[PDB]
Amino acid sequence: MKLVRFLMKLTNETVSIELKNGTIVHGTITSVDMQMNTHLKAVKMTVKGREPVPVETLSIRGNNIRYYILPDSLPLDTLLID
Amino acid sequence: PNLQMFGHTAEVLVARFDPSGSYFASGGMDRQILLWNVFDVKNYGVLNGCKGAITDLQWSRDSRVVYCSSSDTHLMSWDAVSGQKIRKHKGHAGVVNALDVLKVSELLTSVSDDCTMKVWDSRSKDCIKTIEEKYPLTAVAIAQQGTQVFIGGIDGAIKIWDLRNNHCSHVLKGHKDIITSLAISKDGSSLLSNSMDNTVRIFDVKAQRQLQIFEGAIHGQEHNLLGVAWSRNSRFVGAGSSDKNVYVWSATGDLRYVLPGHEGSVNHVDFHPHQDIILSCSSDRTIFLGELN
Amino acid sequence: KAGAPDLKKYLDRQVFVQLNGSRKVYGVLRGYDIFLNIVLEDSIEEKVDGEKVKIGSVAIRGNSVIMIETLDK
Amino acid sequence: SLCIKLLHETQGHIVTMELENGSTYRGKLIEAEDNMNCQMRDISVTARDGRVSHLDQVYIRGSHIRFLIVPDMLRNAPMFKVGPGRSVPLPTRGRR
Amino acid sequence: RLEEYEFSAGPLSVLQQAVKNHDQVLINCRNNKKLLARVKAFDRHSNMVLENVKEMWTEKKRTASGGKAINKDRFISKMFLRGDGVVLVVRIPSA
Amino acid sequence: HLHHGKSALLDLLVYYTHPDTKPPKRRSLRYTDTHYLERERVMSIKSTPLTLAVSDMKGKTFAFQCIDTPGHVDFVDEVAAPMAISDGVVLVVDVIEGVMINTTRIIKHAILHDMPIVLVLNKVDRLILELRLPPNDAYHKLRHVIDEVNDNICQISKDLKYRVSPELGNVCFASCDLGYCFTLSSFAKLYIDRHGGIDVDLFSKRLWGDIYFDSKTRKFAKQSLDGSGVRSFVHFILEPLYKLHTLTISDEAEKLKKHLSSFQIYLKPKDYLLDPKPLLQLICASFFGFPVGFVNAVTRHIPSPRENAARKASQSYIGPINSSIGKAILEMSREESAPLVMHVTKLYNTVDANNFYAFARVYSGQVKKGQKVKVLGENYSLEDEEDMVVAHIAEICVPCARYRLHVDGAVAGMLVLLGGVDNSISKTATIVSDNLKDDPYIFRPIAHMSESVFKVAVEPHNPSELPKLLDGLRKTNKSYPLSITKVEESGE
Amino acid sequence: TYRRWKLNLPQMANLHRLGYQLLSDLRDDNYFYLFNDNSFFTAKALNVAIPGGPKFEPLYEFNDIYKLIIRHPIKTEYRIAFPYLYNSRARSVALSEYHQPSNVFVPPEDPDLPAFFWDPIINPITSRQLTLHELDTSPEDSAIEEDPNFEIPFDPFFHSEDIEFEHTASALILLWAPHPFNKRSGATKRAQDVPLIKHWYLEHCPPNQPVKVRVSYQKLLKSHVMNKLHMAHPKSHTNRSLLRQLKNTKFFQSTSIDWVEAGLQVCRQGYNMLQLLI
Amino acid sequence: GTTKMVSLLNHSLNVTTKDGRTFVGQLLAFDGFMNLVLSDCQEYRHEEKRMLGLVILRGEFIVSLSVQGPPPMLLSGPGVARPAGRGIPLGQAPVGLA
RNA sequence: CGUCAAAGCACUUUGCAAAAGCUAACGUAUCUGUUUCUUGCCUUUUACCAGAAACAGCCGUUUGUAAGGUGUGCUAAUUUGACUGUAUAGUUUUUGUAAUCUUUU
């Protein structure tokens, strides 16, 4: 009975994530947890007021995630079903 | 010397060196791969687990991981340093007969009595590709490029398939009967092949006609899969026979060394990668290291 | 959860609390909570000027609290 | 959980820490908590300014702590398996 | 148990009402950057999946010489918003 | 006293720490008996030492330095020896036997030397199965044991600085067979960790007797029970013990699964179809975990070696406190500069009878291999230097009953096994470093709580081998405190 | 195969109750004191003999009467307890287990009163002899006096289960039983290796028996010592087993029949096998 | 879950915090709150450094995680050899025929 | 109970290896023989009396491993291991006190 369960389907695609911190992060998703803690593969993250730096295995403390900008090819109707 | 080492209980089939030239592996009907040294010629691990008899070993090009092709569909994988199991590549619905490996130790090809070729990754535990022909397959060889895979069947027709296309590009001709072992040179430029007609023919890789039909190495009622090899130079060709003789050729179409020694049918002859030594195996439970000074 | 904190040794003794917004208070420790809500009596402010205003009995919230000290050993 | 037991094990030794306040405190630790409360003595504070002070006794709230700094021998300490139905790690003879 | 009860009657029902009506929504965020879009799905935490989003947010040049208000818009196809960032929702109908 | 469950107490710790160790089937396990004589008889005889890394409530690990003492009345010698080293005494008492002789004989002798006491009521499980007393009448039988301990305290001192009671923390209810020790504080936790928020402390005060609990009002009272007032203790501890030692046993294995699922103990289905006692052990070790209570009940009452240094130095050290050695003891200096002070009491046989390890407390500084060391005696003084002898320290080792830990450098605070320093020593013998400030003093020769008395003559059966017997009789005097050799005029 | 068995509680109950007339009634072990396999070894070695027990072949200036102090003769029982002390030139000796805890379990004779009922054999428990410390507040008063109004909302662990159950009686009787029954899940011996009544000739013979018997009792006991003396610890070996070699050649076949048939079968076979030799 | 988090154990990590500071070192212990324990730690406030040692961070304080480096660090079978020999067979032809 | 991994599963027949590693019933049972010595009763040696030490056999037990057999499933069932295994939007961590501005070097 949670919208979080839909994000566990999301695995594999690339997304530009925004955080409360104000950073921006392009990278492929590997796994998503019930507590929002996502792990990413082949990442290019950029800090607020610094140059972009590539990281291999980024992972994020879910608490900090503002929003995922999902890819345009992903069908929503199919994923919203259990 | 010669060194005729004993060890196996029953018919031994396959015996190969590392790519380096520092070990043997051997194993047939025993259900036991037995590793060896080259230079104090002693045994090592008894790799135990295969519940079917072994039909083909091949060292990983790292000289650590070993791969089998049991008669019970499995293709096992072994850490030659420790001697533990890694996997059971479960796939075929019949007896596997041949294996082959690449440079990149990652990809493997196997050949069933289901008439199915299958390419394997050492990371998935499943088939990447499945090429179904019709009559049970027997011998396979993959090129150094990691592109062309050669299949040998019951029609006498060595078919050639690529990994991109997956089309019947070419079919070798003029072999009347059965193929027991393919073998690509250390160039990537020519095959070897044992037929049941006793014509140990060479073929071309790229125009694609014959080169030299060798003749003088009989197969008979036994129906073992006999082997052939290219020497480290690609000067000599080493074909075994059911006449208890290791027929070494000159590759110019001339029989040089014909050394007996075995009391039973011979199976898979090999060559050492640098120094001139010949691994020769046979149902007999024996193996030789024939040298040239 | 709800580990009732070790404030038994501070009961009926003077304190020097600090809270959020850099504001601080003196008082006799009367009672405490699961969430560290506090009961102080004879409460005296310590303004940024240093002007000390007497208030009386006061209930400080738990969340706010940064720390709690002792004036005399 | 192990990140709490390590703390309890540094009771007695001298500890450094950082709060949301911005200041760092250093002193002998007397008691801790699963909340991350603390009870210390002979503390030597050092704020953003550099201003040193002395505080005889202190209590804290964990919520206010950012991170601790712990003695070096506390890396050889045992890290146990815990279980599904246990609060404290401890070693475990029984089933699991 | 009681979660089922509030979705029909309470405050959150007007999204369920609006999102079923195929409606657009104006959302004031905690980032100081409002979101204007049409919603797909929502949750008890206000975790919302937005489609065809457009932002509205002021700016300054910040002593470029050594500045004035600039508004900027961007279209996003699909967007999962964590409800913590939301502070105020305005469920405006077309009709 | 005898067979009260001392050696089996430590075994209970060992099991939790050393995963490989398993119980011999026929006979108990008795880690820390070692000697084959101690295993034919089965009684412990020579006191052995241990050290192990024991955990606590919350989790903090301390390094205990335990010493099983022989409970047979006649080896009181080897109780007293380490008494002049240890920082406290742990007692073990049988809740069926009660407080017999050696429990008094030691309690009394222990308070004389200001040794703080920790009771451990052992063999409680037994009084639920052997005796099968009902829970209320067993409470009385427990309380009774605690009282009678104190009646032997009262005689030696009327002070209430000592006073053993579970209300305070001194007392520990444990059965070393089934594997569980608890204090009132530990039992409390159990409820508390499973049920929200109350203090452990405000709970454990009220759990001891002459107090009652109303299940209707949810509040305590001294009020004599009106109707179904039980007695806080028997309501929250005993009766939910009693159940365990009758749930497992009575083969109501359907129920146990539902109940033990409450606590999130999950057994495999083989384990119910098992065996009474070793099912019990498996349950009681999965429910009451590590013997944490008993840990917490030592680190709170038996003081750390620094704190006790002050007191311990006063009653044992003969010389002045104002001196440099008297000062170096009080601060527990761990420097190179500091004077090295030991205090050897017992020597231990090694795996062959040839040699003797020494057992001494390092009171100050550091000891390392190959150090020159003035090993004093008993009759020594500042006047004559005839007692003292120089010697080299071969091997320093930390003891663990069966295995030993080879260490390079000792430190103040610890107990140790020394290699090399034997021949000068017979009975007590302080060590002190050679290069020192003048006037190194001795440690008081132990007060044994029994005179030797019994006498026996010993001639060799063949007189040609009289040297060897003579060499042997010296070696006894080393490993047996109270023994005394004394050649008669005749030749005996 | 019929190795390994697991028995219910109530089953083991009946078996116990049916076998009662055979199996013993000691539980302690203290009973044996000078009747252990060890003691009997030392007796043998010291060439002395203890009263109820066996008696073997032998195995193998300083004294002065005027130096001794004759006070209570010193019996044979004394030498077999502390052989190194009271006896000189003590070799080939075994030292015995000095004492065990002592079992305090009396089984319920009248099975109506519950499992946990204060028995009238235990002494009252009165404590008017004692003199304790004194404090003004009093521990219990004080503990409540600090705060009487405080509460505990959760109640104990097993508040629904009662201290007794249906079989909790039967069970306690087992725990403290003689070997085979206490176990409640075993192994599976062979009928030859279940001696039944050996424990009659260990306990040691009840009074008023004729000499015919009392002598037999010893002779039985002797044997039991003499084995326990030389028992070797078994050698490591692979299993030979003749009767499964013969079964692996083509000359023997297998079938199942009645006992008495195969008794006659043998009894005949042997008749002929001698006749043909004669 | 926490299956991924155990995989990180004993690797040198780069941990950004809410303050902006970045801690670095191996990972010894891990929690359900994301409490991390780190060995031989070094902050990089920013051309800056400091040595701390053992550091225990809270969950509130942590932002992101990233691996810097990887985790830090059948006897003899029956077979026997022999020398030579190479006997000649009188007969020719295959093995089964005759 | 829950997850993940491995494996057909339970029952059974043979083969082949092992079975003090830190004082301990491989078997809570228990029998014969050989050699070397000591004593018995004895003169024909065997056959024996009843102690010792040193070797042996025999009747059994356990474990691992290999190949089999019966019954059941290979569109399943069962076993075996492993595990940092629980769900909390209202004060001590994961549904935010954040947002924003300006000056100094």
Ligand SMILES: Nc1nc2c(ncn2[C@@H]2O[C@H](COP(=O)(O)OP(=O)(O)O)[C@@H](O)[C@H]2O)c(=O)[nH]1
């Ligand atoms: N029933 C029961 N017996 C116990 C318990 N603890 C110890 N024992 C028995 O007590 C004896 C242990 O004696 P111990 O104190 O180790 O020897 P000591 O060194 O002479 O004190 C063994 O015979 C155990 O069976 C217990 O908790 N319950």
